[PDB]
Symmetry: C3
Subunit: 454 residues, 3 copies
Amino acid sequence: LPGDFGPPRGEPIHAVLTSPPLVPPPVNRTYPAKVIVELEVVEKEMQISEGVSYTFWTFGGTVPGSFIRVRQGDTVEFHLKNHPSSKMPHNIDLHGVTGPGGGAASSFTAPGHESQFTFKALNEGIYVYHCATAPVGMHIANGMYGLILVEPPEGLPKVDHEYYVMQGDFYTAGKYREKGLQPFDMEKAIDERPSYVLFNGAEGALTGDKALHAKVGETVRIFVGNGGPNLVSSFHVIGAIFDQVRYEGGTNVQKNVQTTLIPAGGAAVVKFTARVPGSYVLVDHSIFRAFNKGAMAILKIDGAENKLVYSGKELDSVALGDRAAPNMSAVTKATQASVSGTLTVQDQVQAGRALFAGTCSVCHQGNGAGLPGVFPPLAKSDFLAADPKRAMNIVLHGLNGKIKVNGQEYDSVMPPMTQLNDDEVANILTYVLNSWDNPGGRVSAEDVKKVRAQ
Amino acid sequence: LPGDFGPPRGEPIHAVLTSPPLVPPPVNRTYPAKVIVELEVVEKEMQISEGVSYTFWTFGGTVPGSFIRVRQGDTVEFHLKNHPSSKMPHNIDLHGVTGPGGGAASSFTAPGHESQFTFKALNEGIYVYHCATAPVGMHIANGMYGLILVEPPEGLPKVDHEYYVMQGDFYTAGKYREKGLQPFDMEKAIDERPSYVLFNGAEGALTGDKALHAKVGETVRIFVGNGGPNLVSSFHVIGAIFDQVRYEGGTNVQKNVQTTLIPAGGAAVVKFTARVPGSYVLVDHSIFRAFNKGAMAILKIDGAENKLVYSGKELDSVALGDRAAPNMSAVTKATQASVSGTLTVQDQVQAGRALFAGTCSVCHQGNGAGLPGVFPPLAKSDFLAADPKRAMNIVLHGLNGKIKVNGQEYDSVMPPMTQLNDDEVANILTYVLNSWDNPGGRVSAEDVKKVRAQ
Amino acid sequence: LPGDFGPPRGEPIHAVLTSPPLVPPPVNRTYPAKVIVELEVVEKEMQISEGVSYTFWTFGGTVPGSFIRVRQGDTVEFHLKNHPSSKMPHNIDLHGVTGPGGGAASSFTAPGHESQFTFKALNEGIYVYHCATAPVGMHIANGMYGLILVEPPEGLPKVDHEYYVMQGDFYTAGKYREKGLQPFDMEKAIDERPSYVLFNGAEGALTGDKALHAKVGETVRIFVGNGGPNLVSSFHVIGAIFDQVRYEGGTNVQKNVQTTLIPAGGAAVVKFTARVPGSYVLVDHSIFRAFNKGAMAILKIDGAENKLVYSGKELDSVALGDRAAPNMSAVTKATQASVSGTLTVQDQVQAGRALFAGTCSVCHQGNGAGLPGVFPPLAKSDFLAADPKRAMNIVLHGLNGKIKVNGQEYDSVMPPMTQLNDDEVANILTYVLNSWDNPGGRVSAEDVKKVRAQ
Ligand code: HEC
Ligand code: HEC
Ligand code: HEC
Ligand SMILES: O=N[O-]
Ligand SMILES: O=N[O-]
Ligand SMILES: O=N[O-]
Ligand SMILES: [Cu+2]
Ligand SMILES: [Cu+2]
Ligand SMILES: [Cu+2]
């Protein structure tokens, strides 16, 4: 067989598993070992977006699940525990396992129980693992996937950084960024119409203050998974190229590509060399996933600019929109305050400030000045102040035709923004009214609900 | 040109075509031949699922169509007959043909007619063929696709087994597993929202008693097609790895991969070596296709267990659901009896028994015992017996909150199962009521229709 | 770094950009140069289909945008101008640029403004460029994409022809071929449900009299882009094979394939050798895109037939439908005449003639004769003449069961054609009534609207 390195030697090894986006250290081993892996399923609510909760089903308390790292030819004794708070039974199918269901029949585990099976890791590569419990799509859609690396016997080449990034498609009953606890939506899932497409189980999980880091001249390896359940990723790095892309345990290695299709249930190892500083965006280049459903992650490179290679500026809110900033925690806070019935004007102002970036600032500017004759001002706007209810209609339904704002004629088009939720429109307009010498006061989510219903 | 092996020699050869999942024997030939291929289009109703009929349009009476096997450099005299029972005209486009439409203009054939064209097979590889008659998508959606292998002059390497598997997406007016003759649905097809995603033209075409077979240590080659019309397959083998994957006639060969994207209209040759016994599942890893729309096939390996490679059990209904069993013929029978107006309690019981596997048994167990305090019993259930109409609402709409069943409190969540058809809910509940000392009687499809409509 | 060819030498070069489907000449240069690229964004209405207008956002006035051709190691001084008629701000992200956003932050340009940034072209390959202005999906959906080729230092191998083809998915508020100015539809775009899938920004942009041309024995290189925003192309040539397919700047080259997946935001260079004359169709083999949404382009090869390679005929309306003919300009004219209120019978007749090809002619024949006993005649049809309102219902809703036409019984099935627009049904039936000794008169779009609404 392949991985014919003999029986296990040395001492039994208790695998150290890591949470995303971190990876266990290289096994750094010249002999096949008995590796004991202990993984516990936990069902729990987490924020899938600011002020949006979702009941995830997790291997090890994270989406994606704990990263497992073994050596080709190792004997793996796999212990799956199902936490007693669980409502569902669970199991595991690991890609790269030689045997029926990749462990599924022998790993079936009720709440409060433990299962074990043993396999030999014959196949070198990066592999998805996931729950295989009927209904399998519901389990995978709730977050039950991760990666197992089976190293070659000599190990992978040394790099400066190793990271763990996994795409998933998610199906909420509510629309994108609709606040509250969102149930799983079986109808959207069967139709392959996801509300969110995420890296590492949340909007902003790898943006702003949670970006991946490296320095100019350093090499970065990323273990990239696609848990699906349904989507194929047009996986892409903006402003850079992959030195290498290798799928699962394939003999084939692609070099010098920027865009690479990762199948549902697929995994790849990509290598990046940092050349110039700034934010490098990992996206699904099925572009409405990246810019409208959350499928964007950041590798931030620090070091000296090289103007002979690139004269341009760091990314800002024009491209990254409301994910240019370190975090959008003011949205989380304003959502919690609405639930408590303690929402203040300042709660709304700070939430609207976060949401205004890109969404509005691309045309009206970060300071609301616009561009005279081209984009009208929101700063000290006579037109805004004259009719706050008109302002709600303009955000939801757009505006075209001749208007006069602060003594100047405009004859342009503001597209409708009907996909913004009532709370988002209310908070954005409350921010504008309380900025730039505007008259103050507030717009409520309920005010916007009524304008939306006409 | 490529395939420059001279004029045909020897005697004219009448091609022996095979029905899926079988393949003609290797051509075993050192000279270029005139090969006469005779293929007849037949329009006919077949079961796309138990109790679900569909009017397929077929090359040779099967979906996929008859397998054609020739040698690179052969001259192929292609005869397409359209059976006189046909209502539509048909033609053929073969991938790997050098010339406009791959045969389409010269193979146009009305009902009761025959067409012929001649081509030289210049291009070695595995290739899709399909109907190219306006409207082309409707013809391909109805089943008009298959494979032609153009062997290299030296032939392919010897293997123990060669099989023929082809994915297709199907568009029925009714929902998945809705019984009766289902028309083609042009609106779903244009939207790329299929009701079924199948291997070899039916649910269960390659599961249970229709699984592919091999023995431990044997090599298996599978000629894998994607007829589409629309979907890209994340083609995957659960619990194994492909030794090799080669697309069409490509120079590139990928080795040691488990998951491989097959384009719409694409074909690949995959090679598998059997290492340990059990069921190896071929799926589209766009997971709701595999587990919710029918996209699963089985390679069953017999031979000795190797506990040093895999200690675990054969797949069961937890993973494979209602396709773990040899067949679901009791569903076909109960559907026919409903049509005839002769449906008995025992017809419903045997149909419900088949449908209970996975769907219900994953939590309630195959014997209905559940798990005390975790999953309540259906065996001798006081809660079930107290209100059969509540039971219908529980299956359709789910159940949460504190209940008491047979003296024990449960405080868990049963997800809704609204995608089950009225007949499926009726037959499942009739099985439960007539099992495990439950009070008997029956639930009708009409009973469930009324509860569904609230 | 890669592309380490030293500082720029010689004179500054003003890049000559080409409109699709043409490509600039090879750079034919042995030294690294300063290349000045001047690209202007223009927002303008164009015909996305006959009688269907759409407001495109373009780089250089075309979809795809102007083709840029430089050499690896060149220093590119990139000037982006936004025409003063523009309503939106715009920027550019070029794939293959080393730096944050691929130029996005430094190229942000309001209407009437100009931006510039400088980059070194370190990475050889074919690369997509596109707008990266919030909301990014809306900009790319409106047509803001093209290709930049970064040649290897030795240049690409010489070929007889180089062409420029780029797929895009488009989202109109109206249905496919619904006439008038069609707005962008954000809901369809977020759902990845396009109304059109096009090569080079229009139905028929590369069919009939706008086909690409070559001769038997000539080599053709096509630079193939997928601008998306959302779809992955199962990119395929009917009746031929690609000698080579190379993605972006990848080291991997696939040879001898017919079907190849191009990611959203991806690009490939394909090479074709012309062997026999006729029309070679480039399609997205997600077949309803190619045959129902416009995703078809033609390479027309002229030269001598080789009956030993292919005995068959050139493609006709059976396969290519209404795109077999040189153009469908009669539809454009009849749509303009409806708008003006000057639509004549002859305007409708010429439009219906164009639309009848394939749509109706596949069964009823180009001369309306049908096939006695199999497909009834439209020529001198007693059944058509007896009830013109029934004819409208037959096109919209189909026809089955026994009928008698011109003394012969038919017992067949005409599928419904409900996706045809009111104007298309009206014009097709007016063509039939005014042909083949039929009684004349006309059907109006309003007549069909009323029958459709029942
Ligand atoms: C893509 C450009 C663009 C974006 C994005 C945009 N606007 Fe506008 N907005 C305009 C233009 C142009 C006008 C003037 C329209 C006209 O000439 O009829 C306008 C007008 C307005 C007006 C009324 C005139 C004024 O200056 O007081 C308000 C209020 C406004 N926008 C608010 C917003 C808010 C809040 C956002 C984000 C939620 C937003 N806009 C996003 C372009 C934009
Ligand atoms: C994923 C788990 C799961 C699946 C699948 C499932 N159930 Fe349940 N079922 C439960 C749980 C948990 C409860 C108790 C809910 C509570 O605590 O409120 C339940 C309660 C019930 C009850 C009422 C209580 C009792 O024991 O009599 C019935 C009847 C029932 N299920 C039938 C079915 C049938 C029939 C199927 C399949 C069609 C099914 N269930 C599938 C978990 C499941
Ligand atoms: C795929 C085959 C097919 C296509 C495409 C088709 N038809 Fe028919 N058509 C038929 C058949 C078969 C019948 C007779 C149906 C029956 O036996 O009940 C028919 C009947 C008719 C009739 C009534 C009988 C007669 O001969 O006068 C009309 C009118 C007609 N078609 C018009 C059209 C028009 C206009 C188009 C295109 C818009 C069209 N058909 C496309 C197959 C087709
Ligand atoms: O680089 N494109 O998103
Ligand atoms: O192995 N996954 O379905
Ligand atoms: O060759 N198929 O469209
Ligand atoms: Cu699970
Ligand atoms: Cu056909
Ligand atoms: Cu733009």
